[PDB]
Design a protein around this ligand. Structure first.
Ligand SMILES: *[C@@H]1O[C@H](CO)[C@@H](O[C@@H]2O[C@H](CO)[C@@H](O)[C@H](O)[C@H]2NC(C)=O)[C@H](O)[C@H]1NC(C)=O
Ligand SMILES: *[C@@H]1O[C@H](CO)[C@@H](O[C@@H]2O[C@H](CO)[C@@H](O)[C@H](O)[C@H]2NC(C)=O)[C@H](O)[C@H]1NC(C)=O
Ligand SMILES: *[C@@H]1O[C@H](CO)[C@@H](O[C@@H]2O[C@H](CO)[C@@H](O)[C@H](O)[C@H]2NC(C)=O)[C@H](O)[C@H]1NC(C)=O
Ligand SMILES: *[C@@H]1O[C@H](CO)[C@@H](O[C@@H]2O[C@H](CO)[C@@H](O)[C@H](O)[C@H]2NC(C)=O)[C@H](O)[C@H]1NC(C)=O
Ligand SMILES: *[C@@H]1O[C@H](CO)[C@@H](O[C@@H]2O[C@H](CO)[C@@H](O)[C@H](O)[C@H]2NC(C)=O)[C@H](O)[C@H]1NC(C)=O
Ligand SMILES: *[C@@H]1O[C@H](CO)[C@@H](O)[C@H](O)[C@H]1NC(C)=O
Lengths: 184, 305, 69
C-alpha cells in the first residue's frame, strides 16, 4: 500500500496530478515511470507470497501427518508426539492452526540395583523372557524393565541356552521349578 | 556407515545505501524516490539470518543436562575412543571431528553464529555420553544407567534376535564394531561434498554481487566520481539513475535467490533434527531411515555447517 | 563499561563471570540480560552438568511414573 506514494522519479505521485501537470506527449514520459515502479512493487509482493505459501504448506503437511499418527494411532517415533512415551493425543482448533495436546508417560523415582546377564543353574544358562535380573543385595528377581515389580525366577519366566561358561558375567542362583512341589 | 547433512549457512548483511551509492549525497537523494525497497531487503536478510541459529538450536540442543562419561571406560569390549572428546585437541573435539574440520568490503558484512564450534562439540559429546551410558532412557526422562552389553542385547531384541545370540558372540560383535569404526577413519582421512557445495554456492553468489559494481547498465562509466566530474547536475541525474536501477535489480536478485536457498537448507536441518530424535535417542524400525540393514544405534558428530 | 566481544564493541553493559541461560543473543557465545538494576553480558551456559553412575553391573529402574500433557 505505501509504495503507492513514491514518485519513482516523476513530478507527482498521484497520476490524477501527473495527468494534471504533464500531459500525453510528456505523460508518456511521466506516467511510464510510475508504471515501471508500481509493477516492480507488485512483483516483489507476489514473489515473497509464493515463497511464504510454500513454508505454510510444509507446516500443514506436518500437521496432517501428526493428526494421522498421533491422534488416530499410537506412535513409536521418539519425540514425534511429545517428550516421553506417547500414550495419546487430542486436537484443538486455533485461529489459523491447530493445537495438539499430547499425553505421555514419564518414569519417575528410580532406584539402584545389581544386574547380571544370565543365571547359572545345573550347569545351564538362563535368560529372562521379558525383563531383567536384579538383586536387592541378597536376593535375585526378574522385573519388567520400565516399572519395578520383582518376581521369583522360575522356569516360566526364563529360557535356557547353553552352558554357564561362555557368557561374561553369569551369576549362580536357583531357578525354581513349580511342577516338582506340585506333584511332590 | 555415515550420513552428512547441512544444517546452516552463513549470515550475511548488506547496507543498501552503501552498496548502491557508496557514500555520495547526490546518489543518496535520488534513491529516496524509490520508496522503501531497501528496508524490505534488509528485513528479508535479517529474517533469514535469525533462522540459521534456529536451525542449529533444534538439531543440537536435544539434551537438558550435559552428561559426562565415566573415567574408567569398560563397555564390554567396545571401544569408542575415536569418537569421544580429546582434551589435547583443538576445541576439545573428537578425533573424527577433526578430520571433518580439516577437509572442509562495501556494505557487505558477515555475522557470527550464536553457538560457537566449541559449544556444538560440547552438545554432541553430551549426546554421545548419554547414549553410551543410559541407552534411550535419557531421551524420555531421567537417564538410567545400564551396562553396555545389556543395552546391546535389548537392541538385538528390538530387531527380532534373541539375547543369547549377543551374549554368546560378544567378543566377535565387539571386534567387528571396532574394526568397522577403524575404517570410517581411513576412508575420511584419505566425501563432504554436500557441505562443500553450500559453501561454494554462497561464495559464488557474493562474488557475483560485487562484480556487478563495475557495469555501466548504459551509462558513461561505472564510477560516481566520474559522472560527478564530467557532467553538470542536470545531466548527471540521468546517468546516475541508470546505475541506480541496475544496482537495485542486482541486489534484489541476490536477495530472492537467498530466500530460495534458505528454504532448502531449512528442510535439511528439519530432517537432521528428526534423525537426531529417532536414530540417536531411539531405535528406529523405519526401513532405510538410519542406515541400510537393521538399525542398532547411531552416533552424532559435528561438522563445519 | 566498554567490552570487546567477537560480535563487535559493546557499551553500557557489565561483563559478569557467571553463566546463565541465554536471554538476548549478542553473538559468538555472548548473551545479555537485565539483572540486579543493570544490564549484564555473559557467556551462555548449555546446562547443568551430570555424571551418570555407570558401572558394568549396576542398573537403575523406576518405581513410579507421572502422566504428562
Ligand atoms: C546409585 O549409586 C550411585 C553410586 O553409589 C549414586 O551416585 C552418587 O551420585 C552423587 C551425585 O550427587 C555423588 O555425590 C555420589 O558420590 C555417588 N555415589 C554414592 C552416593 O554412593 C547414585 O545416586 C545412586 N542412584 C540412585 C537412584 O540412588
Ligand atoms: C531382599 O528381598 C528379600 C525378599 O523380598 C528380603 O528377604 C525377606 O525379608 C523379609 C523382611 O521382613 C523377611 O520377613 C523374609 O523372611 C525374607 N525372606 C524371604 C521373603 O524369603 C531381603 O531382606 C531383602 N534384602 C535387603 C538387603 O533388603
Ligand atoms: C566389572 O567391573 C568390575 C570392577 O571394575 C570387575 O571386577 C574386577 O574383576 C577382575 C577380574 O574379574 C578383578 O581382577 C578386579 O580386582 C575386580 N575389581 C574390583 C574392584 O574388585 C568385574 O570383573 C567386571 N566384569 C563383570 C562384573 O562382568
Ligand atoms: C558357581 O558354582 C559352580 C558349581 O556349581 C562353581 O564351579 C566350580 O568352580 C571351581 C573353580 O572354578 C571348580 O574347581 C569346580 O570344578 C567347579 N564345579 C562345577 C560343578 O562346575 C563355580 O566356581 C561357582 N562360581 C561362583 C562365582 O560362585
Ligand atoms: C581403542 O582403540 C585405539 C586405537 O584407535 C587404541 O589406542 C591406540 O592403540 C595403539 C596400539 O597399542 C597405540 O599405539 C596408540 O598409542 C593408542 N592411542 C591412540 C592411537 O591414541 C586404544 O588402546 C583402544 N582402547 C582399548 C581399551 O584397547
Ligand atoms: C572473571 O574470572 C577471571 C578468572 O580467570 C578473572 O581473571 C576476572 O578478573 C574475573 N572478572 C570479574 C569481573 O570478576
Amino acid at each position: 500500500v505505501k509504495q503507492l506514494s513514491s514518485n519513482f522519479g516523476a513530478i507527482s505521485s498521484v497520476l490524477n496530478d501527473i495527468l494534471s501537470r504533464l500531459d500525453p506527449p510528456e505523460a508518456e514520459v511521466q506516467i511510464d515511470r510510475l508504471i515501471t515502479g508500481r509493477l516492480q512493487s507488485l512483483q516483489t509482493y507476489v514473489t515473497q507470497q509464493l515463497i511464504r505459501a510454500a513454508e505454510i504448506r510444509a507446516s500443514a503437511n506436518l500437521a496432517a501427518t501428526k493428526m494421522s499418527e498421533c491422534v488416530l494411532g499410537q506412535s513409536k517415533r521418539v519425540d514425534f508426539c511429545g517428550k516421553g512415551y506417547h500414550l495419546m493425543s487430542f486436537p484443538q482448533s486455533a485461529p489459523h492452526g491447530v493445537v495438539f495436546l499430547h499425553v505421555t508417560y514419564v518414569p519417575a523415582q528410580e532406584k539402584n540395583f545389581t544386574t547380571a546377564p544370565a543365571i547359572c543353574h545345573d550347569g545351564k544358562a538362563h535368560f529372562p523372557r521379558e525383563g531383567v535380573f536384579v538383586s536387592n543385595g541378597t536376593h535375585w528377581f526378574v522385573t519388567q524393565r520400565n516399572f519395578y515389580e520383582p518376581q521369583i525366577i522360575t522356569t516360566d519366566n526364563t529360557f535356557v541356552s547353553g552352558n554357564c561358561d561362555v557368557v561374561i558375567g553369569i551369576v549362580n542362583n536357583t531357578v525354581y521349578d513349580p511342577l516338582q512341589p506340585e506333584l511332590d | 556407515t555415515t550420513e552428512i547433512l547441512p544444517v546452516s549457512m552463513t549470515k550475511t548483511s548488506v547496507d543498501c545505501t552503501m552498496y548502491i551509492c557508496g557514500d555520495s549525497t547526490e546518489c543518496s537523494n535520488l534513491l529516496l524516490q524509490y520508496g522503501s525497497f531497501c528496508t524490505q531487503l534488509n528485513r528479508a536478510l535479517t529474517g533469514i539470518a535469525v533462522e540459521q541459529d534456529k536451525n542449529t538450536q533444534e538439531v543440537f540442543a536435544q539434551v537438558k543436562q550435559i552428561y559426562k562419561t565415566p573415567p574408567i571406560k569398560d563397555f564390554g569390549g567396545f571401544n569408542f575412543s575415536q569418537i569421544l572428546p580429546d582434551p589435547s585437541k583443538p576445541s576439545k573435539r573428537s578425533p573424527i571431528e577433526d578430520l571433518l574440520f580439516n577437509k572442509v568490503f562495501n556494505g557487505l558484512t558477515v555475522l557470527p553464529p550464536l553457538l560457537t564450534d566449541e559449544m556444538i562439540a560440547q552438545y554432541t559429546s553430551a549426546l554421545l555420553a548419554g547414549t553410551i551410558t543410559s541407552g534411550w532412557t535419557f531421551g524420555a526422562g531421567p537417564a538410567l544407567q545400564i551396562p553396555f552389553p545389556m543395552q546391546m542385547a535389548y537392541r538385538f531384541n528390538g530387531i527380532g534376535v534373541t539375547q543369547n545370540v549377543l551374549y554368546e558372540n560378544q567378543k566377535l560383535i565387539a571386534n567387528q564394531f571396532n574394526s568397522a569404526i577403524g575404517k570410517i577413519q581411513d576412508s575420511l582421512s584419505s566425501a563432504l561434498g554436500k557441505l562443500q557445495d553450500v559453501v561454494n554456492q554462497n561464495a559464488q553468489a557474493l562474488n557475483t554481487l560485487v562484480k556487478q559494481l563495475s557495469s555501466n547498465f548504459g551509462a558513461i562509466s561505472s564510477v560516481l566520481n566520474d559522472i560527478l566530474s564530467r557532467l553538470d547536475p542536470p545531466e548527471a541525474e540521468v546517468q546516475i539513475d541508470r546505475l541506480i536501477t541496475g544496482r537495485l535489480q542486482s541486489l534484489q536478485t541476490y536477495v530472492t535467490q537467498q530466500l530460495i536457498r534458505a528454504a532448502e537448507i531449512r528442510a535439511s536441518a528439519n530432517l537432521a533434527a528428526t534423525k537426531m530424535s529417532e536414530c540417536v535417542l531411539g531405535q528406529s524400525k523405519r526401513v532405510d531411515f538410519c542406515g541400510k540393514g537393521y538399525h542398532l544405534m547411531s552416533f552424532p558428530q559435528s561438522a563445519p555447517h | 563499561n566498554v567490552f570487546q566481544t567477537r560480535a563487535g564493541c559493546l557499551i553500557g553493559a557489565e561483563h559478569v563471570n557467571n553463566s546463565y541461560e541465554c536471554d538476548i543473543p549478542i553473538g559468538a557465545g555472548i548473551c545479555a540480560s537485565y539483572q540486579t538494576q543493570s544490564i549484564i553480558a555473559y557467556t551462555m551456559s548449555l546446562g547443568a552438568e551430570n555424571s551418570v553412575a555407570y558401572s558394568n553391573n549396576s542398573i537403575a529402574i523406576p518405581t513410579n511414573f507421572t502422566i504428562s500433557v
